[model samples]
Target chain A: ASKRALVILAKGAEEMETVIPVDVMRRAGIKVTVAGLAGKDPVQCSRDVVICPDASLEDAKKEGPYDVVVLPGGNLGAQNLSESAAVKEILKEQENRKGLIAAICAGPTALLAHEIGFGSKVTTHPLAKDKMMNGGHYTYSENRVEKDGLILTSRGPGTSFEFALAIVEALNGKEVAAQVKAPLVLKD
Target chain B: ASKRALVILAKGAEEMETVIPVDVMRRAGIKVTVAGLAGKDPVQCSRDVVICPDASLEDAKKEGPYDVVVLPGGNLGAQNLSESAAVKEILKEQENRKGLIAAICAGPTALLAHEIGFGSKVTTHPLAKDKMMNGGHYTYSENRVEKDGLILTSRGPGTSFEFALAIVEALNGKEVAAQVKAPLVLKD
Candidate 1:
C-alpha cells in the first residue's frame, strides 16, 4: 500500500519544519495531507509563509487513520495544538496503537504533556528535554534524526532532511531512505 | 550609519542557519541583505526553501564592503559559495584589510578555502574540521560561537542565533544584539 502521513499545521509552524517534510516524503513517493484545527482557516508558517490545509483536524479524523502523524515545532504552534481536544485524542489513539507519531524540537513537549510518550525512547530539541522527558528515555546526539519505535524527533531546523528521512525510513524502509539520502550526502 | 551584514545564499544552506540569523538580526533592528552569485536570482536554501535575494554579488560589490560578511552553512551551500570568484575576492580584500568575516557550520570552509584563515584559529560545523583539516588550525568546542580576530565562526545551524549575535556584536555592538537575544529566551 502507498503510505500516507498526516501533517498537522498550526498557527506558528516553522515554515521549513511544516513544509520540508511534506516535500521530502512526497518526493519519496509518500502522500502527505495537511490537517489543521477547525477555524484555523489559513495557517501561517513562520513569517510570510502561509498554507491552507487539505483537511481540517475535525475532518482529518474522518479521512484518516493515517500511517504517521507529524507535528512541526514552534512555541505557539505546539501550544495551540496541545489545546485542541481533537489533536490530543488523535495523539492518544496513535500512542496506544504504536503507530508513528513524530514531533521535532519544541513539538515534542506537546506530545509529552498529553501522556503520549510513556515508556518510549525519544529525543527533541536539546534544551527542551525537561519537558520531553515526562515519560520517555532520552538519547543525546547531534544527529539530525532520532528514532524510537514509531516516534521520530530532531533538534532543530538544520535537521529537517534527516528528520524527513526518519519518515521515509518508517514507511519506505531504510533502503529507500538510503536512496533518498544518498543524493543529499547526509551525515549521522 | 546603520550596520549591515551580508548573508550568502546557495544550495544546502540550513533552514535555521539563514532564518534564525535573519530573524534574530532583523528583530534586533540590524539590516541584513541576502545575496548570491552574480547571475543567480532567488536561491534555494537548505530544505528546498527558496529565498529571494536582496541583491546579487555584483550589487554587493558595487555597494562595496558591508560591515560584516556572514556565510551560513549546509555542506552544499558552503561548497558552492567557497568556489565563487566574487565571494573569494571580497573575502580576500576584507582579510587583507582586517575587516569582519564570519561563517557558521560548513560555511567556515569558505573562509578557509579562500586562504583567508591562513594564520588564524577557527571553528566550524562540528566535525567539519576533520573533513577539511588541511584548511588551518581548527578547534572543537561546546561553545556556540567562536571569535577569532575579525573572523567569527560557529558550530552548525543549532547555534545560528548565537553566531548571528556574534556578528551583530561586531558590527553594531553587544547592546544591540542583546536586545534580540534577550527576548528569544535562548539556551545556555
Candidate 2:
C-alpha cells in the first residue's frame, strides 16, 4: 500500500504537535491529509495560529481506507475529535481494517473515547493519564513511543519524531524511517 | 518587562509537554513567543506536524528584553534547545538581568546549558533525571513543580498548569494564580 496517514484536527489544536510531524512525514514521502472534524472550520492552534484543513473528515473518509490515523493532543481538539461519532466510527473501522491508530499528548483521549485499546497499553498527554488509568491502567513512562497492537501512544509533542518514526517503521518500512531520524540521530 | 519564552522546536517536542502550560499562561495573560532553531520557518513536533515559529531566536532576542523565558520540553526539543546558541544567550541575558527563567518537561536542559544551578534543587522531564542529578548537583523529586529562587522547573507536561501557575504565583502570589487555575478545573 502507498504511504498515507490521516491527521485529525479540531479547533484550538496543539499546532506544533499537529504540524511538525506532518511536515516530517511529508519529507519522508508519506502522504498526509489534514482532516478537520465535521462542521469545524479552520482550526486555531493553541498559539492562535490558524490552519486550514487539507480535507474534511467526510472527504478524507472517502479517500481512505487510510493506513494511519494520527491525532495531535489539544484539550479542545482531542475532545472535539473524541466527541465526533464519525471519528469514533472511523477509529473502529481503522482498527478493524488493521490500519494504525496513533496518538500523542491528549490525542490518546480520542483513542480512549472510541474504546480502541483491546488489552492494549497506551499513553496520553500526562494530564489525561489519570482519566485513562481510571479503567485501563497506565504507566508514567518517560519513553516517547508506546505500542500495543495497531495503536501507538506517545507522551506529547516532545516525542513526535519517535511516534512518527514508529509509524513509519510499522507501515512504510524501517529503513525509510531510519533515514528520516538519521540527522537527529534519535535512538529508537 | 514583557514575558518571553524559548519555545524549543525540534524533532520530538511533546505536544502537550510544549502546549498545555503555555496555553494556561496565555489564558492567564502572559506574553509569549515561539522560538525554533530549525531555521525561521517551521519545526516538526514528535508527532507528524510542522509548527511555524512566532519568532526565531534572533527575532525573540531583538524583540526583548523579556521578564521571563520558558522552555517547554520534549525529548529532542529539550536537547536541541539546550544545544542552541539563541537559547544559551537567553539564559546568559537572564543571568545579567536577573530575570525569571522557567522550564517544564526536560526543559531543565536550558539550566544545564546556561549552568544556572550551582546548587539548585530541580525536577525535570522524566527522561533526564539522571542527567540533572549529575549536572546541576540537583535534588530530584517527582513533584509537579520546583522553584529554586528565580529559576523554576517542573516534572513534565502534567505539571504545565502548575508551571504556568508558578509564574502567576510568582508575579501575583498564590491567591491570584490559584484563582486563575480554579476555573480551568485542573485536578489536584
Candidate 3:
C-alpha cells in the first residue's frame, strides 16, 4: 500500500514550506492530503497566497493513522497549530502509534507545545530556535534536516526540499528520494 | 518606489515554482500580483495544489507595465501560457520596455511560443530543453538559474529560490536579496 501523508495547512503558514513537501511527496508516490487547519476554506499563507486544501482537518482526522503528519510553519501558523486541541490530539495519536511526525521551520514548535516528542534531537528555523528551546524539552541541531527517530524536523523555507526529501527517504527509501530529487535541479 | 511584478498563474502551473517566486519577491518588498490566465478561479497546479489568483489576467493587464513579469512552468501550464494571446501581449510589451521577464522550469517555452527574447541565453527543466529550443532561437545553458539581459530563466522547483533571489537582486539590488536570503536558511 502507498504511504499516506497528512499536511496540516493553516492561515499564515509558509506556503513554500507547505507546498514543497506536498509536491515532492506526491512525486515520490506518497498519497498526500493537504488538510486545512480551519474549515475547508482556502488557506491564506504568510505572504497572502491562498491555497485550497484537499480536505478539512476535521474530515482528514477521521481518515487517520497516516504514515506521516506534516507541519509547515510560519509564526502565526505555528501558533495556530500550537494552540489547536485538534492538532494536539493528532500529534499525540501519531506519536503513540509510532507514525512519523514531520515538521519544518516553526512547525516543530508545535511539537514543543503538544509535548509529543520530548527529548528528541530536533532543528528549527534559526529565528525559531529560542521559542522551540523554551524549556529544554528537546536537543537542537543546526543541521538543515534532522531525523530523530520518527520525529523529523528541518529549518526554514530554503531547507524545505531537503526536509521533504528526507521524509521520502524515511518512508519510501533512498532510491525513491534520489529519483524525485534529480529532476528538481537542486543545489548540493 | 516599490517594484511591481505580475505572475501569470494558470491551471497545471507548477505550484512550487509559482509560490516560491511570489513569496520571495514579496519578501524583497516587491508588490506582486498573481494573475490567473483562466479568470478569477483558483488554479489547479500540476501536483493538484489549487492556488487562488489575486485577479484575472484581463483585470491585471489593465494595471501593467510592471517591473517584472514572471512565468511558472508545468507542462500543461506552459501550454496554457503558450496558447494565450494575453501572454503574448504581456511578453511583447515587457520586452519592448526592456523589463525583466522571468520564467522557470518549462516557463521559458512560453517565451518561445510568443517568439520573445530570441538570441538570449536561457535554461529550462531538462525535459523542456528540446521544446524550448525547437527552432534554436535562443542560446541555452544548463545553469540552474540563467540570466541574459532582461530574460531570466531557471530549471525546476529546486532552483526556485535561486531563481527568485536573482529576480530580487535585479529589481531590488544585492543587499535586499542578501537580507531576504538569510532567513530562508539556504544552503551556501
Candidate 4:
C-alpha cells in the first residue's frame, strides 16, 4: 500500500517549512495531502506566499488513516493549530493508533496543546523552546531533527529536509530515502 | 539604502526554490516582488504548490532596475522563461547594468537561452547540465552554489538555503546573512 500523509496548512504557516516537506515527500512517492486548516482555500503564509490547499481539514479527515500527520510551523500557525479542537482529535487518534506524528519549529507546541506525546524527546526552533517546555512535560534536545519513538520533531526551515527524509525513511525505507536525497543535491 | 528583488514566477516553477529566496530576502529586509510571468494569476509549481504573485511581469518591469532578478527552476518553468522575450530583455538589462541575476537548477538554462552571462563559471542541477552546456559557451563547476561577477547559480532544492543566503549577503552583507541563517537551525 502507498504511504499517505496529511499536512495541515493554516493561515500564517511558514511557507518554507510547509513546502519543503510536501515537495520532498512527493519525490519519495508518498501521497501527500496539503489540507487547509480553515477550508479548501488559498492560505497566506508567514512570508506572504499564498498556497492553495488540496482539501479542507474537514474533508481530508474523512479520508484519513494516514501513515503520518505533519505539522508545519509559524507562531500564528501553531497558535491556530493549538486552538483547534479538530487538530486535537486528529493527533489523539494518531497517537492511539501508534502512527507517526511529525512537527517542526513552533509545530511541536501543538503536540503540547493537545497532550499527544508528552514523554517523547523533541526539538523545536530555539525561540520556541520555552513554549514547548512550559510544563516540562516533554524532554527537549538541541538536535536539528529528533525522533523519539512515534513522535518526530525538527527545528526550523533548515531542518525541514532532514525531518521530511526521516519521515520518508520511516514509511518507505532507507533506500527510498537515499534515492530521494540524491537528486536534491544536498550538501555533505 | 533599501534593496529590492524581482522573482519571476511561472507555471511549473519549483515552489521550494521560489519561496525560499523570497522569504529569506524579506527576512534580510529586502523588499521583494513576486512577479507572475503570465499576468497577475496564481501559478502552479513543480510539486503542485500554487503561489499567487504580487504583480504581473508586465507591471513589475515598469518599476524595474531591481537589485537582483531571481530565476527559480523547474524544467517547464525554465522552458517558459527561455522562450519569453520579456525575460531576455530583463536579463540583458540587468547584465548591462552590472546588477545581480541569480538562477538555480534548471533556471541557469534560461540564462543560456537568453544569452546572458556567457563566459562566466556556473553550475546547475546534475540533470540539467547537458541542457545548460549544449552550446559550450560557459565554463562549468560542481560547486553546490557558484557565483561569477553578476551571475549567481545554485544546484537543486537542497541548495536553496545556501543560494538564498548568498543573495542576502550580496544585497545586504555577511552579518545579515548570518543573522538570517542562525534561526534556521541548519545542520552544522
Candidate 5:
C-alpha cells in the first residue's frame, strides 16, 4: 500500500514550507492530502500567497489512519494548529498509533501545546525556542531535522526540504528518499 | 524606494518553484506581486497544488515598471507563458528598461519564445537545455545560478533559494541578502 500523508494547512501557514513537502512527497509517490484547517476556503499564507486546499480538515479526518500527519509553520499558523481541538485529537491519535508526526519551524510548538511526545529530542526555529522550552518538557537539539522515534521536527523554511526527505526516508526508506532527492538538484 | 518584483504565475507551474521565490523575496523585504497569467482565478500547478494569484497579468501590467520580473518553470507552465502575448510584452518591457529578468528550470525557454534576451549566458533544468538551445541564440552555462548582466537563470527546484537570494542581492545588496539568508538556516 502507498504511504499516506496529511498536511494540515491553516491561515498564515508558511506557503513555502507547506508546498515544498507536498510537492516532494508526491514525487516520492506518497499519497498527500493538503487539508485546510478552517473549512474549505482558500488559505492566506504568512506572505499573502493563497492556497486552495484539497479538502477541509473536517472531511479529511474521516479518511484517516494516515502514515504521517505534517505540520508546516508560521507563528500564527502554529498558534492556530496549537489551539485546535481537532488538531490535538489528530496528533494524539497518530501518536497512539505509533504513526509519524512531523512538524517544521514553529510547527513543533503545536506538539508541545498538544502534549504529544513529551520527552522527545526536538528542534524548532531559534525564535521559537523560548516558547518551546517553557517547561522544558523535552530535550531540544540544533539539528536541522530531528527525529526522536516517530516524532520528527525541523527548523525554519531553509530546512523544509531536509525535513520532507527525512519523512520520505522514514516511511519509504533511504533508497526511495535518495531516488526522489536526486532529480531535485539539491545540495549535498 | 523598495524593490518590487512581479512573479508571473501560470496554470501547471511548478508550485515549489513558484512559492519558494515569492516567500523568500518577501522575507528579504522585497515587494512581490504574484500575477496569474490565466486571468483572476485559482491556478492549478503542475503537481495539483492550487494557488490563487494577487491579480491577473492584465491587471498587474498596469501597475508595473518593477525592479525584477520572475518566471518559474514547469514544462506546461512555461508553454503557457510562451504562448501568452501579455507575457511577451511584459518581458520585452522589462528588458527595454534594463531591469533584471529572472527565469528558472524550463522558464528560460520563455525568453526564447519572446526573443527578449539573446546572446546572454543562461542555464536551465537539464531537461530544458535542448529546448532553450534550439536556435543557439544564447550562450549556455552549467552553473547552478547564472547571472549574465540583466538576465539571471537557474536550474531547478533545488536551486530556487539561491535563485531568489541572487535577486535579493541584486536589488537589496549583499548585506540584506546575508541577513535574510541567516534565519533561513540555509546551507553555506
Candidate 6:
C-alpha cells in the first residue's frame, strides 16, 4: 500500500510551502490529500494563490489514519490550525498512534499551541522563533530539517523540499526519497 | 508604481514552478495575475494540484502590457503553451515590446515553438534538452538560471526560486529581489 499524507490547507496557508510537499509526495507515489480546514471549497492562500482542496478536514478525517500529517506555515494559517479543536484532536491522535507529524515554518507554532511533541528538538522560521520558544518546551535547532522521533519540523519556504524529502525518507525509505529527489534538480 | 506580471497558467502546469514564482514575485511587490490558459476556471496541475486562476487569459490580455510574462513548465503544460495561438500572439507581442519573458523547466520549449528569442542562451530540465534544442536555434546553458536580453529561463522545480528572483531583479531591481529572497529561506 502506498503511504498517505494529509496536508491540511487553511485560508492564508503559504502556497509554496503547501504545494511543494504535496507535489513531491505525490511524485513519490504517496497518496496525498490536500484537505481544506474549513469545508470543501477553494482556499485563498498567503500571497493570494488559491487552491481547491481534495477534501474537507471533516470528510478527510474519517478516511484516516494517514501515514503523515502535514502542516504548512503561514502566520494566519498556523493560527487557524492552532485554534481548531478538530486540529487538536487530529494531532493528539496522531501523536498517540506514533504516526509521523511534520510542520514547516510557522506551522510548528501550531504544534506549540496544541502542545504536541513537547521536548522534541525542532525549528521554525527565524522570525517565528520567539513564538515557538515562549515556554522553552522544546530545544531549538537551526538545521534546515529537524526530526526528533515522530515530530518533524523545518524552517521557511526554502526548506520545504528538505522537509518533504525527510518525510518521504521516513515513510518510503531512503531509496524512494533519492529517486524522487534527482529530477527535482535540488541545490544540495 | 508597482510592476505588473502576467503568469499564464496552463492545464497540467507544474504547480510548484507556477506557485514559487508567483509567490516570490508578489513578495517583491509585483502585481501578478495568475491567468488561466483555457479560461478562468480552476486548473488541474501536473501533480493533480488544482488552482483557481485569478482571470481568464482573454481578460488578462486586455489589461496588458505587463512588465514580465511568465511560463511555468510541465511537459503537458509546455505542450499546451506551444500549441496556443493566444500564447503565440502574447509572446510575440511581448518580444516586440522588449518585455521580459520568463520560462522554466520545459517552458522554454514553447519559446522554440513560437519562434521567439532565437539565439539566446537558455536552460531547461536535463530531460527536456532534446525538445528545447531540436534545431540549435538557441545556445544551451547549464546554469541554474539563464537570462539573455529579455528572455529568462531556468531548470526544474529546484531552480524555481533562482528563476523567480532573476525575474524580480529584472522587474524591481537587485535590492528588492534580495529583500524578497531573504524571507524565503532559499538554499543558495
Q: Report backbone clashes per prediction.
A: 0, 27, 0, 0, 0, 0
Is 3 or 4 the stronger prediction by DockQ? 3
**Scored by CA lDDT, what does every candidate get?**
0.72, 0.72, 0.95, 0.94, 0.95, 0.96
**Residue B56 displacement in candidate 1 (angstroms):** 3.1
Q: Across residues B102-181, which tens digit of lDDT does each residue of candidate 1 receive? A: 88888888876777766556777556777656734554454567787787888865466567778777777778877756
Q: Considering only chain A, what is the TM-score of each predicted structure?
A: 0.88, 0.91, 0.99, 0.99, 0.99, 0.99
lDDT of 3 by residue, A1-188 (tens): 88999999998999999999999999999999999988899999999999999999999999977999999999999999999999999999999999999999999999998998998999999889999999999999999999988899999999999999999999999999999999988887
Ranking by DockQ: 6, 3, 5, 4, 2, 1
Docking outcome class, model 2: incorrect
Which 10-residue window of candidate 6 chain B scores lowest in summed lDDT?
A: B179-188
Candidate 3 Cα errors over 4 Å, as ranges: none
* Model 3, position B181: C-alpha lDDT score: 93
The best candidate by lDDT is 6
Best first by TM-score, ranked: 6, 3, 5, 4, 2, 1
> For every model in order, what is the iRMS?
6.6, 8.4, 0.6, 0.8, 0.7, 0.7
For residues B30-127, write the lDDT of model 4, one tens digit per residue.
Answer: 99999999999889899988888999999999998899999999999999999999999999999999999999999999999999999999999999
Docking class of 4: high
Candidate 2 wrongly placed segments (more than 4 Å)? A1-34, A37-43, A46-59, A63-188, B1-6
lDDT for B90 (candidate 6): 98
Per-residue lDDT value at B150 in model 1: 83
Q: TM-score per candidate, in order?
A: 0.59, 0.60, 0.99, 0.98, 0.98, 0.99
Residue B52's C-alpha lDDT in candidate 4? 88
Candidate 4 chain A worst ten-residue window by lDDT: A179-188
| Candidate 6 lDDT, B1-188, residue by residue in tens | 87999999999899999999999989989999999999999999999999999999999999999999999999999999999999999999999999999999999999999999999999999999999999899999999999999999999999998999999999888999999899888777
Compose the digit string of candidate 2's lDDT tens values, residues A99-188: 888888888877767887656778766677886666654444445678888878887655666677788788768888777665432333
